[PDB]
Amino acid sequence: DIIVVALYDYVSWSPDDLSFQKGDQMVVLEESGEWWKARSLATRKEGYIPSNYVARVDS
Amino acid sequence: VRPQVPLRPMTYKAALDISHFLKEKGGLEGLIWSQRRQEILDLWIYHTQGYFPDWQNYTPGPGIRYPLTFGWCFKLVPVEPEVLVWRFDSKLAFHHMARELHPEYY
Which amino acid type is present at position A59? S
Contact B50, B7 (CB under 8 A): yes
Domains in chain A, ordered, with CATH?
A: 1-59 (2.30.30.40)
User: Which residues lie closer than 8 Å to B15 by C-beta, 6 or more apart?
Assistant: B55, B69, B70, B71, B72, B73
A with B: how many residue pairs have Cβ under 8 Å apart? 39
Which residues on chain B are in Cβ contact (under 8 Å) with A8?
1-3
Rounded-to-integer distance, Cα B60 and Cα B67, Å: 10
CATH number, residue B92: 3.30.62.10
Q: Which residue in chain A has the smallest CA separation from B45? A: A13
C-alpha angle B89/B78/B55, rounded to 5°? 55
Number of independent structural domains in chain B:
1
List the domain range (segments joined by +) for residue B1: 1-106
Of the candidates A13, A33, A51, the beta carbon closest to that of B17 is on A13
The CA distances from residue B82 to A25, B17, B58, B89, B97, in Å, are 52, 30, 16, 21, 21
Tell me how the structure was determined: X-ray
A8: left (phi over 0), alpha (psi -120 to 50) or beta: beta
Query: What span, in angstroms and rounded, lies between the C-alpha atoms of A7 and A4?
Result: 9
Report the residue from A9, A11, A35 with minimal CB separation from B8.
A35
Entry resolution (Å): 3.5
CB B17 to CB A9 under 8 A?
no
Chain A residues with CB under 8 Å of B11 CB are none
